[PDB]
């Protein structure tokens, strides 16, 4: 579903790597994709608890690429701690061995509910939006605003929004111009790491005459 979007974003970042991520800090899926040769064992150790296993799911994709993934229980999703993972073949050869932190692999949903408004003075625009729905730690989410204009202007402005702030003020814009706005989200440092969310639903505005 919405899962497929994020899996594709990551695959382009690190092909044939072991990509793990969290959507809402309350779960975790690790996955990889490979060619022609579950014939694999997924084991993990979490902070002072013995080594456990995870049910691998096998499904196809792309050009002959098989995607294996594991969904860890909500029981073992406490954050801020080393989580050791091992993928070992049937044959007993190693395949992957990582140490990640749960908190350091956050890929949130896109922000929603964009509302763009003109300022009382020409050239200024007020943008508001909503955090990714049903996400905790709204205070630690930082956003980036993209300002495009049509007709081969492309991306003109790229504005980082402070943590927890769902409000953006734009200036320095040309009057009488149809600009298009989107925002993405990411978890702020150093408590959390990860990638930018997919870009939000766009809204457009026509700036007044100057």
């Amino acid at each position: 579903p919405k899962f497929e979007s994020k899996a594709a974003l990551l695959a382009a970042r690190g092909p044939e790597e072991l990509l793990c991520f969290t959507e809402r800090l309350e779960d975790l899926v690790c996955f990889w994709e490979e060619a022609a040769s579950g014939q694999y064992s997924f084991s993990y150790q979490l902070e002072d608890e013995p080594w456990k296993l995870c049910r691998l799911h096998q499904a196809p994709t792309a050009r002959g690429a098989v995607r294996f993934w594991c969904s860890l229980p909500t029981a073992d999703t406490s954050s801020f701690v080393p989580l050791e993972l091992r993928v070992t073949a049937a044959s007993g050869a190693p395949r992957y061995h990582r140490v990640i932190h749960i908190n350091e692999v956050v890929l949130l949903d896109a922000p929603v509910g964009l509302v763009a408004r003109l300022a009382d003075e020409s050239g200024h625009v007020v943008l508001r939006w909503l955090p990714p729905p049903e996400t905790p730690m709204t205070s630690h989410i930082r956003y980036e605003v993209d300002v495009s204009a049509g007709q081969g202007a492309g991306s003109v402005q790229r504005v980082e929004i402070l943590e927890g702030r769902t409000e953006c003020v734009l200036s320095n814009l040309r009057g009488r111009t149809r600009y298009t706005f989107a925002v993405r989200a990411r978890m702020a440092e150093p408590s959390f790491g990860g990638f930018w969310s997919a870009w939000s639903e766009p809204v457009s505005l026509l700036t007044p005459s100057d």
Partner: protein, 289 residues
Amino acid sequence: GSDLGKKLLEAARAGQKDEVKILMENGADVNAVDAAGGTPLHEAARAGHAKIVLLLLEQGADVNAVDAAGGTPLHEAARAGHAVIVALLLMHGADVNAVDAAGGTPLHEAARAGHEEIVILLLAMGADVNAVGTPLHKAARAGHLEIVKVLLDHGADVNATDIWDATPLHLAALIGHLEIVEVLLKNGADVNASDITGTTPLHLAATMGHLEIVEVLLKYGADVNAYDLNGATPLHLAARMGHVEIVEVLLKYGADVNAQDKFGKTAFDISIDNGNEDLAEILQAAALE
């Protein structure tokens, strides 16, 4: 315990210093237990309220009381990082090497959580530096540099192995903790120790793309052409992951370009399979030599 007893469990948890004294003066049972078999001592050690910890131990609170999970207040104080309370408990005879259901000693928890001082305090009172569920594994994994320094100074086993055949150097190598790898190596960590999968630290470093670590390992005499159960050398792993700089460092130290894994694949084969321009150019040059 008594009705005042659970009121005391209420108050201990809440850190309410006044109220704790009130309930005890009324004859509350100091060793009352909750649903989890936790005592007010457990709760006060968890929240780090010094004066409650004082009043409890002065009224004969059980220093080594265990909850249902095998945890003593010393475990909770070490886990929560309350140095003073750990001290108070230790002075009153808390068991330094008591172990929870999970085989964890306070030194285990303190090392994992990165409480420097508590690890010092535990070690001074004679905590077993090489007990079960090795502290050095956790410290190495987590990147607690100073703690790894203290562990090694106090005589921790540099090449202790877990259930996988993994040593602290394996974990340090994997996570890209360069200094820790340095400290480990100088204390006599085996650079070419193998887990059951046939992986050496160099294998991990090459695979994760940790260039400098690969260099440090190589200087200390890591085997450039060691093979895992795939018959894969560091150069095979580096190739698959597209690590250009690492391939060059491997080359510097005498890597075998035409080593074939159990698929019969060379690093160059891998490069073509991944359509890696950069690797194919440099590996092609190296193959002709």
